[PDB]
From Swiss-Prot:
Domain text: The PH domain mediates the binding to inositol polyphosphate and phosphoinositides, leading to its targeting to the plasma membrane. It is extended in the BTK kinase family by a region designated the TH (Tec homology) domain, which consists of about 80 residues preceding the SH3 domain.
Disease annotated for this entry: X-linked agammaglobulinemia: Humoral immunodeficiency disease which results in developmental defects in the maturation pathway of B-cells. Affected boys have normal levels of pre-B-cells in their bone marrow but virtually no circulating mature B-lymphocytes. This results in a lack of immunoglobulins of all classes and leads to recurrent bacterial infections like otitis, conjunctivitis, dermatitis, sinusitis in the first few years of life, or even some patients present overwhelming sepsis or meningitis, resulting in death in a few hours. Growth hormone deficiency, isolated, 3, with agammaglobulinemia: An X-linked recessive disorder characterized by growth hormone deficiency, short stature, delayed bone age, agammaglobulinemia with markedly reduced numbers of B cells, and good response to treatment with growth hormone.
High-level lineage: Eukaryota, Metazoa, Chordata, Craniata, Vertebrata
Quaternary structure and partners: Part of a complex composed of EEIG1, TNFRSF11A/RANK, PLCG2, GAB2, TEC and BTK; complex formation increases in the presence of TNFSF11/RANKL. Binds GTF2I through the PH domain. Interacts with SH3BP5 via the SH3 domain. Interacts with IBTK via its PH domain. Interacts with ARID3A, CAV1, FASLG, PIN1, TLR8 and TLR9. Interacts with MPL/TPOR.
Every SH3 domain range: 6-66
Protein task: Non-receptor tyrosine kinase indispensable for B lymphocyte development, differentiation and signaling. Binding of antigen to the B-cell antigen receptor (BCR) triggers signaling that ultimately leads to B-cell activation. After BCR engagement and activation at the plasma membrane, phosphorylates PLCG2 at several sites, igniting the downstream signaling pathway through calcium mobilization, followed by activation of the protein kinase C (PKC) family members. PLCG2 phosphorylation is performed in close cooperation with the adapter protein B-cell linker protein BLNK.
Part of the intact protein present: 212 to 275 of 659
Organism (species): Homo sapiens (Human)
Protein localization: Cytoplasm; Cell membrane; Nucleus; Membrane raft
Protein name in UniProt: Tyrosine-protein kinase BTK
């Protein structure tokens, strides 16, 4: 409904994945990012720790933190 902060959290990174042209986000292994979308596809539009947004394969990333 409103306030995206409700259903929106961060995610971790499993394998490495550098950008190709500009869309893709520079992921890595052990690092985590910030999710801004959640479309019906594995690739989202999340940003890393550099104020930059790109794509993040759902399978490649997981939960930003795990207790």
């Amino acid at each position: 409904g409103s306030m995206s902060t409700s259903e929106l959290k961060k995610v971790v990174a499993l394998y490495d994945y550098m950008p190709m042209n500009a869309n893709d986000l520079q992921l890595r292994k052990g690092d985590e990012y910030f999710i801004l979308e959640e479309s019906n596809l594995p690739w989202w539009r999340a940003r890393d720790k550099n104020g930059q947004e790109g794509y993040i394969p759902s399978n490649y990333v997981t939960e930003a933190e795990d207790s």
